[PDB]
PDB file of C-alpha atoms in Angstrom:
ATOM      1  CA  UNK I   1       5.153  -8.995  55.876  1.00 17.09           C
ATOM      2  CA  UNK I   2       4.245 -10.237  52.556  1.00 16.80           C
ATOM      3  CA  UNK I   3       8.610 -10.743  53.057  1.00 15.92           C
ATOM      4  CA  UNK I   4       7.950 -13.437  55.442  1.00 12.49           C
ATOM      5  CA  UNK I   5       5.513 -16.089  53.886  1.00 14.91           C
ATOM      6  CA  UNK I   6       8.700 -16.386  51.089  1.00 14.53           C
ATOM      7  CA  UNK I   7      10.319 -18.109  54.459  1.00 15.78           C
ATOM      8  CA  UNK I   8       7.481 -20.684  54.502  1.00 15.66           C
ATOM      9  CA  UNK I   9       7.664 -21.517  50.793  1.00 18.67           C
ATOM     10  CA  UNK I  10      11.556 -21.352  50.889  1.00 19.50           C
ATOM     11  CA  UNK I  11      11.678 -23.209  53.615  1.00 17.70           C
ATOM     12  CA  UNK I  12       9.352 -26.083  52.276  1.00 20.31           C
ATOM     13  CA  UNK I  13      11.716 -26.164  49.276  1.00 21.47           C
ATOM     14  CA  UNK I  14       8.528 -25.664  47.131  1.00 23.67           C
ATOM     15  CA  UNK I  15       7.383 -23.163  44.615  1.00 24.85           C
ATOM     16  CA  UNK I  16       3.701 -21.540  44.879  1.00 21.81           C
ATOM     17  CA  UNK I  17       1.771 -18.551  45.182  1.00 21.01           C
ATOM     18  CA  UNK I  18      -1.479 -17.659  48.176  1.00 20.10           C
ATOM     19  CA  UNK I  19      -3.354 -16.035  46.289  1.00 20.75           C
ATOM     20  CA  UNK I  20      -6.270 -13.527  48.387  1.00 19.76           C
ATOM     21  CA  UNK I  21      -9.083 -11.801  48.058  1.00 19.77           C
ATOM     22  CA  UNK I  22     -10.850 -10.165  50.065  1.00 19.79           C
ATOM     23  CA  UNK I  23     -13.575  -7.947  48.784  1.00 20.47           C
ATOM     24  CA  UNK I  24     -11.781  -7.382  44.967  1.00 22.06           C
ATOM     25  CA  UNK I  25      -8.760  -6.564  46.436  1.00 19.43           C
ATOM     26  CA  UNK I  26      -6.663  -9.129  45.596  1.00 18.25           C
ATOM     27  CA  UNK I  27      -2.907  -9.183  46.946  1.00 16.79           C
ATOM     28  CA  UNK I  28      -0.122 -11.947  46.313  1.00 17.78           C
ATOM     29  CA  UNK I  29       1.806 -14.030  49.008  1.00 18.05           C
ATOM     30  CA  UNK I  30       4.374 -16.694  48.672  1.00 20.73           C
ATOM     31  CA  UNK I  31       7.956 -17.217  46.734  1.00 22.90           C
ATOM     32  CA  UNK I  32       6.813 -17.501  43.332  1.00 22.29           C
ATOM     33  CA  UNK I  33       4.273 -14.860  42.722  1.00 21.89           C
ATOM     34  CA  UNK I  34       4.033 -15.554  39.005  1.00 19.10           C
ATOM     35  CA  UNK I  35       1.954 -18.566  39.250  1.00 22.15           C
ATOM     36  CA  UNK I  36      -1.147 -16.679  39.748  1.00 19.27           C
ATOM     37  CA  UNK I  37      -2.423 -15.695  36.428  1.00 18.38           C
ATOM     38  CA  UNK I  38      -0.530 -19.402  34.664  1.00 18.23           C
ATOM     39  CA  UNK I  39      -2.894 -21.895  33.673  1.00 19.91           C
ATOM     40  CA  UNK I  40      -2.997 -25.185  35.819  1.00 23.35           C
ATOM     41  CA  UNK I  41      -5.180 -28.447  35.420  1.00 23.46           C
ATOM     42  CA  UNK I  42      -7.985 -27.529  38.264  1.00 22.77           C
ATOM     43  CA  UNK I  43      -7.492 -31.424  39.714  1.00 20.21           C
ATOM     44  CA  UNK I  44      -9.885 -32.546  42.460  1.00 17.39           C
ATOM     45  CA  UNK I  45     -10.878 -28.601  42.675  1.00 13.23           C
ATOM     46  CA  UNK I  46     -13.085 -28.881  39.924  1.00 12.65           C
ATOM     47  CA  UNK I  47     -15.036 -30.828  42.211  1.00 13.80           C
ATOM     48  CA  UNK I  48     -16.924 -27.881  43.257  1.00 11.54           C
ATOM     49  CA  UNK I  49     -18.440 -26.356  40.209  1.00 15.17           C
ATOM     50  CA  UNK I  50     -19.032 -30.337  39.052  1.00 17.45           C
ATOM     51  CA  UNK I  51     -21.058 -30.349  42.282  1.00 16.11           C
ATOM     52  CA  UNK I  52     -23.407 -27.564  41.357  1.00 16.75           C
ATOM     53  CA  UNK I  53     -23.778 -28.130  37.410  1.00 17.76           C
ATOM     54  CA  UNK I  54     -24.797 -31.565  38.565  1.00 18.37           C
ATOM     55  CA  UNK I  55     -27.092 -30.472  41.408  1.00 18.62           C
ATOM     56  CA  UNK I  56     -28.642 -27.261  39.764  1.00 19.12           C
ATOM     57  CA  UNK I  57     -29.177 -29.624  36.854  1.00 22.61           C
ATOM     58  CA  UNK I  58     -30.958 -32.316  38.718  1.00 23.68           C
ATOM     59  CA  UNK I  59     -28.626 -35.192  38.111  1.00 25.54           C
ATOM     60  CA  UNK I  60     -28.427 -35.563  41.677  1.00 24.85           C
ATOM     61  CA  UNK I  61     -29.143 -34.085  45.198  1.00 24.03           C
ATOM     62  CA  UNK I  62     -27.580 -34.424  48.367  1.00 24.12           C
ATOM     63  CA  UNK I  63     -29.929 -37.250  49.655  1.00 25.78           C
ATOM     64  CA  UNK I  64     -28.684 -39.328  46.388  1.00 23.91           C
ATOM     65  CA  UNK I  65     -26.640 -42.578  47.633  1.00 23.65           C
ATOM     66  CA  UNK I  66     -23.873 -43.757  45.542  1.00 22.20           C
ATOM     67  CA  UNK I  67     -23.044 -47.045  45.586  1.00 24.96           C
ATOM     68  CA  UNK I  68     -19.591 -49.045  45.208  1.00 22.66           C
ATOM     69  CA  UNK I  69     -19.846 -51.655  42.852  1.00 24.65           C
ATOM     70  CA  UNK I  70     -16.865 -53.639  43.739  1.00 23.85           C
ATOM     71  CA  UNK I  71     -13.787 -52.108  41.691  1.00 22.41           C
ATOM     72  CA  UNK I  72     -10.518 -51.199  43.977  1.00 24.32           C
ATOM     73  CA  UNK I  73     -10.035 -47.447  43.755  1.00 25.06           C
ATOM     74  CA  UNK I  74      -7.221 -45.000  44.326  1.00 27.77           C
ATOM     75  CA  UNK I  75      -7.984 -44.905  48.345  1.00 26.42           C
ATOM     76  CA  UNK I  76      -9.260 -47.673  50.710  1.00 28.01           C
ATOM     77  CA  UNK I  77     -12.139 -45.237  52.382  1.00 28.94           C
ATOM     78  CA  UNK I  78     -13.331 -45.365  48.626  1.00 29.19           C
ATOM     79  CA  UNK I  79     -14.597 -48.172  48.250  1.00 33.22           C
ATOM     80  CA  UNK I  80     -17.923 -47.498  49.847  1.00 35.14           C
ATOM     81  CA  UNK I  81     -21.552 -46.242  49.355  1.00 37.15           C
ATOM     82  CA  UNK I  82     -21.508 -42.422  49.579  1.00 35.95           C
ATOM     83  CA  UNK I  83     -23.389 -39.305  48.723  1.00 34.49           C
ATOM     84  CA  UNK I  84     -21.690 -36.432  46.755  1.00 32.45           C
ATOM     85  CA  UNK I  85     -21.569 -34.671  50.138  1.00 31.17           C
ATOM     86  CA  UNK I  86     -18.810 -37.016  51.792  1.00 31.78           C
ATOM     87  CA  UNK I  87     -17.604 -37.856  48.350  1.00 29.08           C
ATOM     88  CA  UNK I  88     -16.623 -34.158  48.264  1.00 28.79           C
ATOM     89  CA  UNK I  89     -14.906 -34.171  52.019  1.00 27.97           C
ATOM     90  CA  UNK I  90     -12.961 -37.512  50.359  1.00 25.44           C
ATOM     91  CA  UNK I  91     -12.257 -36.013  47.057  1.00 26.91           C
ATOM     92  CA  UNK I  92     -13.836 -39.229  45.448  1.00 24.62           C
ATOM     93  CA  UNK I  93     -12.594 -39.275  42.009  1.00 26.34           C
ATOM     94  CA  UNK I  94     -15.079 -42.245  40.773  1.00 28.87           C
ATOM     95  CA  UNK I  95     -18.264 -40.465  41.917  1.00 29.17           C
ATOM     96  CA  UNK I  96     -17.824 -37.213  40.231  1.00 27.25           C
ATOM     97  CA  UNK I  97     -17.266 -39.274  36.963  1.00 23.87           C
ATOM     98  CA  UNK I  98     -20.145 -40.918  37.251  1.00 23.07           C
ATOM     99  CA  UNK I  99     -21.892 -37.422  37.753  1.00 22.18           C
ATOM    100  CA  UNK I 100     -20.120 -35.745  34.881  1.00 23.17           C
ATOM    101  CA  UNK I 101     -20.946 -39.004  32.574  1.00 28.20           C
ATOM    102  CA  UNK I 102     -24.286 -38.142  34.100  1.00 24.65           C
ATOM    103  CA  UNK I 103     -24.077 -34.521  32.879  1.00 22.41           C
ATOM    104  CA  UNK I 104     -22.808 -35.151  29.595  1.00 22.20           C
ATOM    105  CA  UNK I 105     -20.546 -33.278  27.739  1.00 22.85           C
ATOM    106  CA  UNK I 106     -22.762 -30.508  26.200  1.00 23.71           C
ATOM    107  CA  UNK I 107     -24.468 -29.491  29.128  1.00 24.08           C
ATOM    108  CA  UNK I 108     -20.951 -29.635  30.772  1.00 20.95           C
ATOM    109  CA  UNK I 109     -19.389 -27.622  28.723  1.00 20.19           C
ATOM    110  CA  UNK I 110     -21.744 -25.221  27.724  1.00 20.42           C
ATOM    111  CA  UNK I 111     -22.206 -24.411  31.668  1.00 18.19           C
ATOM    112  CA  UNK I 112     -18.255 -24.478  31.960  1.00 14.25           C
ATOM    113  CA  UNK I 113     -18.032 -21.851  29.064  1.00 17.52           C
ATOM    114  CA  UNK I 114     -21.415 -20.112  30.819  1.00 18.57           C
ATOM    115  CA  UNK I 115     -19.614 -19.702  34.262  1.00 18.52           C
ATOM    116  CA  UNK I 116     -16.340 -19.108  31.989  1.00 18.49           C
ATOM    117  CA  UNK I 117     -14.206 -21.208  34.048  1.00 19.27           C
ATOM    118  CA  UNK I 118     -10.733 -21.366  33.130  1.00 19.79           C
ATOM    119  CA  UNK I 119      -9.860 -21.529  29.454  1.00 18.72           C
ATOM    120  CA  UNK I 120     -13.588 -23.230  29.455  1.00 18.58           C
ATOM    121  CA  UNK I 121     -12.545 -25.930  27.246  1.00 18.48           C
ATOM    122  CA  UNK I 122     -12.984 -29.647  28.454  1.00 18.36           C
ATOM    123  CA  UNK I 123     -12.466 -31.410  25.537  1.00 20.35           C
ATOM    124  CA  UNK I 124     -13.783 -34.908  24.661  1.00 21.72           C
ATOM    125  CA  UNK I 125     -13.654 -37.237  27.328  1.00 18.89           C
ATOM    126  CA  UNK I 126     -16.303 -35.411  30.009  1.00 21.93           C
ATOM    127  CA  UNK I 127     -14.792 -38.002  32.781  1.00 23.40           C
ATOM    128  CA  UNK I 128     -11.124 -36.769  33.039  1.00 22.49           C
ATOM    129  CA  UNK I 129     -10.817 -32.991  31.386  1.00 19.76           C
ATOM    130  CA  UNK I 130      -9.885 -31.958  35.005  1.00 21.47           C
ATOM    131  CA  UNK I 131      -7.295 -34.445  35.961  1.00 23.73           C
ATOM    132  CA  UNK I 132      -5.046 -33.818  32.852  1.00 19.38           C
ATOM    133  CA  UNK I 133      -6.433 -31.421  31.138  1.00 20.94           C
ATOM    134  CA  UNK I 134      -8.087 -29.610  28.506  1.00 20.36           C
ATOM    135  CA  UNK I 135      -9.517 -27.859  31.492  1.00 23.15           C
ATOM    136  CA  UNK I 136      -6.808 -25.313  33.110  1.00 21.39           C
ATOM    137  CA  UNK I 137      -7.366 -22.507  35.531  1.00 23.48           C
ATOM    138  CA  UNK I 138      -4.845 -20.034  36.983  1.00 23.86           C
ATOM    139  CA  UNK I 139      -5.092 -19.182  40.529  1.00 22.57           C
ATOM    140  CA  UNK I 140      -6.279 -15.904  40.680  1.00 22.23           C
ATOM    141  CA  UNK I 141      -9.120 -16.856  38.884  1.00 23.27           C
ATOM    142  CA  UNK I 142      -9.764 -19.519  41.045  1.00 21.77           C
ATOM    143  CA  UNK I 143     -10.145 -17.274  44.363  1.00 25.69           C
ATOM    144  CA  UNK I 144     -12.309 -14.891  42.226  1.00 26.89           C
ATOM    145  CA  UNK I 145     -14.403 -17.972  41.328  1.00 25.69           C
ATOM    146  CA  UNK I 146     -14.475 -19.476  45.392  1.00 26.97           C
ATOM    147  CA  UNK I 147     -15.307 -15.856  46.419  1.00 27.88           C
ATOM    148  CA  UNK I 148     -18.615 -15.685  44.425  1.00 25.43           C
ATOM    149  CA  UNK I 149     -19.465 -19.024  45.489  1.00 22.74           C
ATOM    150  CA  UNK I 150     -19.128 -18.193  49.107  1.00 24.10           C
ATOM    151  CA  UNK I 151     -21.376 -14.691  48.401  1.00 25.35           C
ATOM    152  CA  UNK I 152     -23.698 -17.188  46.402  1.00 28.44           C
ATOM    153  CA  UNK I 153     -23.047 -14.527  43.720  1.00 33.80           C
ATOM    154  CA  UNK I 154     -22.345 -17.832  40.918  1.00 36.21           C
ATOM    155  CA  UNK I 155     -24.619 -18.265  38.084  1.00 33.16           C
ATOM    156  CA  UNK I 156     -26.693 -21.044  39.599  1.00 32.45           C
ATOM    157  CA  UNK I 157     -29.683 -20.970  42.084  1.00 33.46           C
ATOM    158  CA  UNK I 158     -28.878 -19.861  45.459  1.00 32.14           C
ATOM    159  CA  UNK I 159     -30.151 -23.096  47.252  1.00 28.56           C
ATOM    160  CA  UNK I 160     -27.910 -24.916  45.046  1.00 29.13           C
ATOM    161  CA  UNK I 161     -24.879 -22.908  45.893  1.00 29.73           C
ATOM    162  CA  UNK I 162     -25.448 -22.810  49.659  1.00 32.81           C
ATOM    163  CA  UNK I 163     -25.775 -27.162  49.766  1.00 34.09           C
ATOM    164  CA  UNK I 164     -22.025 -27.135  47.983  1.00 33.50           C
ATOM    165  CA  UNK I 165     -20.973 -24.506  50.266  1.00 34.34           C
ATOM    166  CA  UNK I 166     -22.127 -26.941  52.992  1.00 33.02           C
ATOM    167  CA  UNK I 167     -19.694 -30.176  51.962  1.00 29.72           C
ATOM    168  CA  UNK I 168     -16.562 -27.805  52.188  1.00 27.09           C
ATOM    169  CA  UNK I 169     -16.359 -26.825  55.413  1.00 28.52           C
ATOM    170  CA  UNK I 170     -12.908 -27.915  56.958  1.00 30.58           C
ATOM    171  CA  UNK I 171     -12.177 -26.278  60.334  1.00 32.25           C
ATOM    172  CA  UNK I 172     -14.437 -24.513  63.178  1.00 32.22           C
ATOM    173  CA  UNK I 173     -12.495 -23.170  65.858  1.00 32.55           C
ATOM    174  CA  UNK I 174     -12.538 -20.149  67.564  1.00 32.43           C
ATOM    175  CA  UNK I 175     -15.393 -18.852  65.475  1.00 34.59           C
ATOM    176  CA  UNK I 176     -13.290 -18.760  62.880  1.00 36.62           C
ATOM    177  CA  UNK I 177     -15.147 -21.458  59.940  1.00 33.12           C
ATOM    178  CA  UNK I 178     -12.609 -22.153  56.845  1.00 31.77           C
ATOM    179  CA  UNK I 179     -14.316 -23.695  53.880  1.00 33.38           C
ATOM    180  CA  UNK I 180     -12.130 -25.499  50.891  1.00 32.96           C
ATOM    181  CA  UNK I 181     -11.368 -27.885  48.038  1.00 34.13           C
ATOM    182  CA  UNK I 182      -7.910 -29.396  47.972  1.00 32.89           C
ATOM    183  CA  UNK I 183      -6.799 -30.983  44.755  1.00 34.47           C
ATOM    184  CA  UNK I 184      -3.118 -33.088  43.179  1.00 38.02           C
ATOM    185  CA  UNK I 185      -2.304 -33.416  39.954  1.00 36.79           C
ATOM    186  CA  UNK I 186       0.100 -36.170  40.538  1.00 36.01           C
ATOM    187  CA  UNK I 187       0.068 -37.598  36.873  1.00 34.12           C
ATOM    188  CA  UNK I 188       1.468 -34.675  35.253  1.00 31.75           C
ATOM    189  CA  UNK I 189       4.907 -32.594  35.813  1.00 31.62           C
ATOM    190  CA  UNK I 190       5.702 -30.593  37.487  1.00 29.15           C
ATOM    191  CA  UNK I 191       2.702 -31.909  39.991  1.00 28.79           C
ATOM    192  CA  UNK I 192       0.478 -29.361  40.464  1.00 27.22           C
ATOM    193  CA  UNK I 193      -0.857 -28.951  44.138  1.00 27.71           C
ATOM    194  CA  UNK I 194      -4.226 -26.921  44.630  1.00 29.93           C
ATOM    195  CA  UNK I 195      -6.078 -25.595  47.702  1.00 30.64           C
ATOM    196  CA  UNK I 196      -8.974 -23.237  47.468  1.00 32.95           C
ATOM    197  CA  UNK I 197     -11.635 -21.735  50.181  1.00 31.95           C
ATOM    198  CA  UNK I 198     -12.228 -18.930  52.471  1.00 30.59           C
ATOM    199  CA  UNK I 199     -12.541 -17.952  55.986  1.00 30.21           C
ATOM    200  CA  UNK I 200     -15.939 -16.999  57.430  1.00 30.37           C
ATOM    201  CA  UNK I 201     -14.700 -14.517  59.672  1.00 31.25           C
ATOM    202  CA  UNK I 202     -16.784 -14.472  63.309  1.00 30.61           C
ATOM    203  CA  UNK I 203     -18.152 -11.018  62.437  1.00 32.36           C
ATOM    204  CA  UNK I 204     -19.193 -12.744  58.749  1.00 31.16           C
ATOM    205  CA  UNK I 205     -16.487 -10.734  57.142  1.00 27.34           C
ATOM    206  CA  UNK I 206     -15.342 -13.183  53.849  1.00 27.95           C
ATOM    207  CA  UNK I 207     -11.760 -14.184  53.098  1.00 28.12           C
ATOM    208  CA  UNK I 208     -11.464 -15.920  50.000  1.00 25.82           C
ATOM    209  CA  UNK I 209      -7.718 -17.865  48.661  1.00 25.30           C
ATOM    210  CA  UNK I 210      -6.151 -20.040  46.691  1.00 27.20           C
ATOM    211  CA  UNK I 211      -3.627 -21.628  47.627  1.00 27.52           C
ATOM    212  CA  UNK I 212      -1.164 -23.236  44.617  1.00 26.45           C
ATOM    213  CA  UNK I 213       2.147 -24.816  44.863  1.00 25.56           C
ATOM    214  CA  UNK I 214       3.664 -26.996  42.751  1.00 26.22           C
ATOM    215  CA  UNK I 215       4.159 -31.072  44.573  1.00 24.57           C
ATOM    216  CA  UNK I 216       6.422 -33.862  44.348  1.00 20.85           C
ATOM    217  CA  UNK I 217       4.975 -36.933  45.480  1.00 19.29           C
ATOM    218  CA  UNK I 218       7.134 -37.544  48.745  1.00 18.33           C
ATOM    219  CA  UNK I 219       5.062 -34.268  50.482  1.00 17.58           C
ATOM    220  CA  UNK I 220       2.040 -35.364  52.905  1.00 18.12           C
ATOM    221  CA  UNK I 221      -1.071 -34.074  51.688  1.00 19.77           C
ATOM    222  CA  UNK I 222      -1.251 -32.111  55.281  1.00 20.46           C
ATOM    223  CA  UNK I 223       1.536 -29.859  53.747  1.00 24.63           C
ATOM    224  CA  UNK I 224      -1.069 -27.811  51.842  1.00 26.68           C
ATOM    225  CA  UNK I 225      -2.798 -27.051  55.130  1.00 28.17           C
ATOM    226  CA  UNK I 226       0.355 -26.886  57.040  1.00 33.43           C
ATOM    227  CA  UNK I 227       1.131 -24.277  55.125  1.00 30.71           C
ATOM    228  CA  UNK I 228      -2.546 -21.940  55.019  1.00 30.65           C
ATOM    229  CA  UNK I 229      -2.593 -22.162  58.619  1.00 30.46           C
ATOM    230  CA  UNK I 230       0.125 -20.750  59.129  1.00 28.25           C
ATOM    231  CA  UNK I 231      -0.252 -18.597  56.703  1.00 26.63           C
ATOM    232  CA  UNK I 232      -3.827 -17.001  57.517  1.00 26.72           C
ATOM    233  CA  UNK I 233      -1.977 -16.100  61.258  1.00 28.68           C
ATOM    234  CA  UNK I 234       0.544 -13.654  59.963  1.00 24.55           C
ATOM    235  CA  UNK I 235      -1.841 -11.990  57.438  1.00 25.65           C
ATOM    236  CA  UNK I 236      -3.879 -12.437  61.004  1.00 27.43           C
ATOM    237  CA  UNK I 237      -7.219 -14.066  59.212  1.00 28.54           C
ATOM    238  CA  UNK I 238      -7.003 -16.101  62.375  1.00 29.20           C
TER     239      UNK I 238
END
């Protein structure tokens, strides 16, 4: 049973770990179950506790527009005006820079080392500790982190934590509602691939993962998710 997901991550010829949670319990699945407690870069992730340190802070709010000043980014629907909100469903590299040059790197870090995310060190430049580091996280402790965002238990205001909460949802079918970050280290190697969240359950019950797995760059982003799907039906989440 937890022999079976090693035929999806054989199969895939990758190498990463699903990391769950539900309710402190935490229990491994995959083909390489060492990955959970090594350190990786966070990637597009980090996106989520940005979100929050920048919200709770007040260098933002979910009305704020952002707007595209001309420069060609990493994806076409970049270049547009957008609010954090569907900056976060596009993980929008560019705006969460701005934010973090926003929040400066003393109030960033000192909240990073507050929530004690990761090794909690982000280094100099505040606009890319995430995408290559100083910043690494391993997966267990992201699911532990994911699961007291989605039971608002994170040190920040609960409004705060519920508006994040509300940018990550990513499927609602069958009553089933499964929230999550995905994130790609493609610049360092071996690439790094990231994909963190939880199920709502219909009867509310919480079902928190992280899903890591190390990428090449030929693999459709859709591989993470091809994956988790299929994954949450035999350990029967959905």
């Amino acid at each position: 049973h937890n022999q079976v997901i090693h035929q999806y991550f054989d199969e895939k010829n990758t190498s990463g770990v699903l990391v769950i949670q539900t309710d402190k319990k935490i229990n491994l699945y995959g083909n390489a179950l060492s990955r959970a407690n090594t350190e990786y870069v966070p990637a597009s992730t980090f996106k989520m506790l940005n979100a929050l340190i920048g919200l709770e802070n007040q260098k933002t709010d979910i009305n704020e527009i952002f707007k595209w000043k001309g420069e060609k980014r990493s994806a076409t629907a970049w270049e547009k005006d957008m609010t954090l909100g569907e900056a976060m469903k596009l993980s929008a590299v560019p705006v969460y820079q701005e934010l973090a040059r926003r929040i400066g790197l003393d109030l960033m870090q000192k909240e990073v080392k507050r929530i004690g995310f990761g090794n909690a060190e982000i280094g100099q430049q505040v606009d890319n500790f995430w995408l290559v580091g100083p910043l690494k996280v391993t997966p267990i402790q992201e699911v532990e982190f994911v699961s007291q965002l989605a039971h608002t238990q994170l040190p920040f205001s609960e409004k705060v934590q519920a508006n994040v909460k509300n940018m990550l949802l990513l499927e609602e079918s069958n009553g089933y509602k499964i929230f999550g970050k995905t994130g790609w280290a493609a610049d360092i190697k071996p690439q790094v691939g990231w994909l963190t969240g939880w199920v709502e359950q219909p009867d509310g019950k919480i079902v928190a993962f992280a899903l890591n797995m190390e990428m090449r760059s030929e693999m459709p982003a859709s591989i993470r998710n091809e994956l988790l799907m299929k994954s949450l039906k035999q350990l029967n989440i959905i």
